[PDB]
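Hi L.,

You mentioned the student needs an example of a multi-chain input paired with its predicted structure. This one should do, with 238 residues in total across all chains.
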Amino acid sequence: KGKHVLVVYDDLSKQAAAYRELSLLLRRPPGREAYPGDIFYLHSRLLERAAKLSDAKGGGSLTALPFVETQAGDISAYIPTNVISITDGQIFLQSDLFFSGVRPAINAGLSVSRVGGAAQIKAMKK
Amino acid sequence: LDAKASEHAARMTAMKNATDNANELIRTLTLSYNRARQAAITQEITEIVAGANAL
Amino acid sequence: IVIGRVGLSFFRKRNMPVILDITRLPDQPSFADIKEIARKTVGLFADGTFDELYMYY
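Structure written out for the whole complex:
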């Protein structure tokens, strides 16, 4: 309808675990870590519906902030890897930074935005 | 002369202690690496067999 | 009077007045290597700049 919407998914890992539970209950053969084959397709289908529409479509937009919880800071895990491969960028929060006194604990080296610059005010860009 | 002799002896002792500590750390890390390798093989074979017999 | 750069760093980090310095020195030092600073150290006492000498090693 031309409006702008912000959507927050506070945990995609729990949704993935629930989908794994459903798939195992439906007798569908498991894959890595008992996850089903289309665990990547699930999140890709979910996250590809957020977009900036063109002027012919109304000009509305939908921005999403999915959440992923790691285990002991391990990033090479299946679900974190899959979600990182989909989104436009990631923000990294680290416990050692959190306890060192810097809050928010954003890791500047690991965090990145693929739309940076174009999504900033001119003064901030300068 | 006494200061130089003391400095050389102190360097020798400190390097010996550091070498011993490094060797012990190597041993512990090797033990942990072997346990992790065994666990990884177990997990991969268990997933293989579960997927194979899930048909 | 300090021999070795770590003493320079320590006393400079502190608020300490240091007048004579020598940093580089061979592994097997010789008399003539820093005889030039030993002469100055004895000449300072002979000159009345300070009235007492202590050495720590």
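You could point out the following to them. DSSP finds five helices and four strands in chain A. The longest strand of chain A covers residues 4-9.

Best wishes,
N.
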